[PDB]
Amino acid sequence: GSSGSSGSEEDDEVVAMIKELLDTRIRPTVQEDGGDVIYRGFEDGIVRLKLQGSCTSCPSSIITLKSGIQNMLQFYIPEVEGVEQVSGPSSG
């Protein structure tokens, strides 16, 4: 709900992969916590994700799971390098 466009910019075997690991227990997992991770765009490894979570539920946990996840991706997919929050609050 914003523009409308079924299908991505020509999905590859690399993406199809990330997507999975993203669908596995990443996207359906975040929600459980508090946020919606949507991988939209992939460059320099940095997978463009539009996630958003308010409930920090302590940092340790975040740096434990939150960060832990970022690792999982790289671990499995040697392609990606980092993560980013595409589309977020930030003016100055």
List the CATH number of the domain containing 21.
3.30.300.130
In a domain, 1, yes or no: no
Query: Residue 83: phi, psi to the nearest 5?
Result: -130, 160
CB atoms within 10 A of CB 45: 14
| 8-state DSSP, 45 | T
In a domain, 68, yes or no: yes
- Token digits of residue 46: 């940095």
Q: Would the annotation count 58 as a binding residue?
A: yes
Burial of 19 by CB count in 10 Å (0-12 exposed, 13-18 middle, 19+ buried)? middle
What distance in Å separates the CA atoms of residue 9 and residue 6, rounded to the nearest whole number?
Answer: 10
In which element (H, E) is residue 32 found? helix 27-33
In which element (H, E) is residue 49 found? strand 46-49
- The position carrying tokens 């991988």 is 39
In a domain, 18, yes or no: yes
Which range marks the domain in which residue 47 is found? 12-86
In a domain, 3, yes or no: no
| Number of structural domains in the chain | 1
In a domain, 7, yes or no: no
What distance in Å separates the CA atoms of residue 68 and residue 45, rounded to the nearest whole number?
Answer: 17
The SS3 of residue 23 is: helix
In a domain, 2, yes or no: no
In a domain, 33, yes or no: yes
